[PDB]
Symmetry: D2
Subunit: 328 residues, 4 copies
């Protein structure tokens, strides 16, 4: 499974690629970058260092974010992208043409990847490079701690959106300068989890996450507003979750619509460092919400929300009782 192979590639590397990250930051510093208008400077850097001409093309197809023409070294970027997104596109292409060898050797370090998986992993590492270039490690880590992890304020400072900030936060595993260890999740209204990235072993790092009581799936009921939750898994470990929906503009009233929820999760021990714990009492184990990973694999015994019987237990029927607890 190509995308699952790459998910596991990043999971195995603690969602941190030291050489690549360093590389991005080095290039950011050596080439004189300054956060603020990074799109203009990335165009200039492409001109000066790779002979690549960046044009903002309002003639690209409606769905095309960028197209690179290697024969003339011409990078076309969609006019409808915001500066942060233009910067991301340009930095992705920069990874692919100017960091090709580093990415190739990083891919080689996992000899089990399939061919399709290797192509997908190249794209994933280029996206990682773009993130670590738009958000150079040191500056971003300092900003995240100074701002107490306010994702919106971080976006505002670095001119990027919610999802990108959450990506970068889940990558702060540089030895001796680590940020809060995070698990990053992306889902749609139907529960499809299309992105999993985690600094370390979490319950939802690879599978699971279909618990309707979990706040991430409640984001769509509160669109564009940040939701939060103190959650306890069936094994007693407790976690702090923040989430928010993200919507793709334009498209048109009739157009195809993009709707996702992005969630960030960490051990409850770290919650006190988040602006999102403001007003919440964290030391009270009785105010935690009991959630699970998905009913078929959830051993809780008195859940009123349970959707399916637990695959490990007895499905006893009682003809003489009516209960508000399904499959109890």
């Amino acid at each position: 499974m190509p995308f699952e192979e790459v998910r596991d590639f990043f999971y195995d590397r603690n969602n941190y690629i030291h050489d690549l990250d360093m590389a991005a930051e080095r290039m950011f510093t050596e080439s004189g970058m300054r956060t603020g208008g990074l799109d203009i400077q990335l165009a200039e850097l492409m001109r000066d260092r790779f002979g690549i001409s960046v044009v903002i093309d309002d003639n690209l197809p409606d769905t095309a974010k960028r197209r690179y023409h290697p024969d003339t070294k011409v990078l076309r970027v969609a006019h409808w992208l915001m500066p942060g997104q233009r910067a991301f596109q340009i930095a992705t292409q920069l990874a692919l043409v100017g960091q090709s060898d580093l990415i190739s050797s990083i891919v080689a370090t996992d000899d089990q990847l399939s061919t399709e998986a290797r192509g997908v992993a190249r794209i994933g590492l280029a996206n990682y490079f773009a993130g670590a270039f738009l958000l150079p490690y040191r500056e971003f880590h300092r900003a995240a701690e100074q701002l107490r992890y306010d994702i919106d304020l971080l976006g505002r400072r670095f001119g990027v959106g919610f999802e990108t900030v959450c990506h970068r936060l889940s990558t702060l595993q540089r030895p001796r300068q680590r940020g809060i260890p995070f698990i990053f999740i992306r889902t749609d209204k139907a529960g499809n989890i299309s992105k999993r990235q985690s600094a370390t072993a979490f319950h939802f790092s690879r599978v699971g996450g279909s618990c309707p009581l979990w706040v991430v799936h409640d984001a769509f009921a509160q669109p564009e507003r940040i939701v939060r939750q103190v959650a306890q898994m069936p094994d007693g470990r407790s976690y702090f979750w923040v989430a928010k929906t993200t919507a793709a503009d334009g498209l048109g009233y009739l157009g195809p619509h993009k709707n996702f929820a992005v969630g960030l999760g960490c051990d409850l021990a770290h919650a006190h460092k988040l602006v999102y714990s403001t007003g919440v009492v964290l030391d009270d184990p009785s105010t935690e919400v009991p959630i699970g990973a998905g009913c078929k694999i959830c051993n809780r015994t008195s859940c009123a929300q349970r959707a399916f019987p637990y695959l490990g237990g007895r499905v006893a029927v009682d003809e003489n009782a009516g209960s508000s607890l399904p499959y109890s």
Copy 2:
């Protein structure tokens, strides 16, 4: 998998159990039932015909809707249940003590069921009987046509809730007295589909339904309000879907909460008979929403919402292109 076995049991019988339904209706008429306050009348019927004392009990555990004591023939019903729900509980018990043999032979018609499945199927048939007794077939079918399938108005007339009405609408397959053929779906915020029932073969009768563009998963974003949609599958068949959330009251601010979405679906050809098509243009194939059964088994080529690649194809990676269409 017992609950899947029973799902397929009802699916194979076109979600209509002729013997049982008729039994219900007969008993409704022979014993003088009158729509309105069926809970009191069912208590009287239990007493007069089975010697069973129905008492309203506020001492039962919080989660108990009813408890039947066969040794003294005493049926205790939860005080916090509305009259329609009390009637449902009492009539479920009525099925189980007074229709035991009929239920057993109906189960016997499927010699492939496992033991657990046989018990679960008995409970399912008891629920079917309860529904067909609270909503006797002729009266309810006539009401459904008279009210143009307005689920709220049907509930008001028969003193029951949204979910029950939808249950009953999905069973009107009595030969020569058929209602609109429906597929009934129940989901949670996480997309777990816990109920599937269908008059005939529909796409989601047994599997699938994890398409984020399908309006059933959008019910939770518009809580307590009826949502509707003209949906088109990848094979061209068009359907009308109506859905609404249902919440279990009481429980308390800290208590466990029950939240589900219930959807009714039919061929687009039938939509014009629904009050829910009022104001909607049905003859315009361009105003239909293109949905799927779930990205991994969806062959659409330009879905902006796609969460996973379609397993029936391949998408080569293109290092030189950025798209708003995932897995193009």
Copy 3:
């Protein structure tokens, strides 16, 4: 204005009518009532004590909750009403036919009411009696304290809805057995405040409440779910607000729809007694949301949400762009 006259009538009486309340409770006790299935028992009491025959009529007009025919003493009640609501209707009629004189003298205690206002006040006092009969003071006050004011659990225990419980909670001003002093508000999506009741002087007891940052107006964004907020008025006083929407069933997809939000508010000092304070930090004056009574009468100086200029002040700056309207 007739409805404002009666609003002020109840406001002046601290939203507690001692004689009437006591009356209800006595009647509840002397006639052997038991909380649970009060609708059946109220029908029995109407027959035994007033010769009033209660029929559940599925033939009433669609919008009629009840109609009383004094010539035959026949009380018709809508079949689509839940048992708690039927009980309420029956007890309203009970107030009007069996407590006529008490209500008349209570109204007489306010010589300023207009004639229309006196009629509206009779109906209001009958509703008060119905509330105090379905929810007898002693039992309900004890239950509220035991349940830490969980409105849903009170509704479950007494078989009534959110709005009725909140009504009754805001009336627990009986000397030597007081509940948390509350201000009761009902609004629609457009901000129209159609009900105001308060145990004591609150900011929104009589006027105001059009602040978009106030959580009550956010109830409609989170339908059927309880919303809560620690609010600070411009004068520094802090309050705890809980609110929830209430929707009228039936009616039909095309039918006329009723949607309201009901909010309960009290001084922050009392918040710790509410189940709704669970998980909330109450001692931190910095986590309070700064709201007002309505922009035109709100003196805050750096509100990004401000809708209109404050009437007490108004500078234009051709050389500046601000995210603060009417700085």
Copy 4:
């Protein structure tokens, strides 16, 4: 009451200022502007034609969108603004320094304005100019008709937000090149209507609009999604309404938040021209929603939602109704 004075100022002029609009368009064309990245080009224009240096400032206070320093001719623009918004700020300053006399004479055409109202109206005309420069009349009107008034698609093409597009749509009253006549509304969660603009006389042009059944107040229930409604007033006139909430980003989790709903309304006769009529049956007077201007002045007799009694109209101790103040 300055803001009500300026509201009436624009209402009296059909929400179209012909001289200023033309000016904007001329300046757009004469200076070689091209739709797309107008913020950079407006910086260039400011420098070349008025000697004003536009700098992107991340040192301004958090609430300052721009500060112009007339003593050194330096316009500082907030870094957290999107390109359309930076362009809007720059064009506002351009109005105020380069169209000062035109704006002054336009204000002078209403000798009844108070002193404060004159300043507020100067700002209003500067904003009008910014809109008419970012969205040049001919080009924008053509785009609106081609795109069937898709507000999002118009925003995408011209690099601006929902509210700005709706603003511009409500001004297309240029003689012989008119767009759909619209009434533009902005409200908050509490029903406060802070903006009213109308091409012609509509019910809510100056007063009213507190009807809970009106779809504009339902936008917050469906945040960030376009809502639509076919509404009929108590006088029989029918209207098509579209609305959507708009939220101000940044600010922070604890920060002060800006939330508004912006609604566009037109006569039902025009609805068939809107993309938003797709899927709606428009000819069925029975599928129209009966709304009002606000209960105290609404004469409907069977509204279940009624909040206050109608001022133009008895208690019945023997009846209980689901229709308040019947």
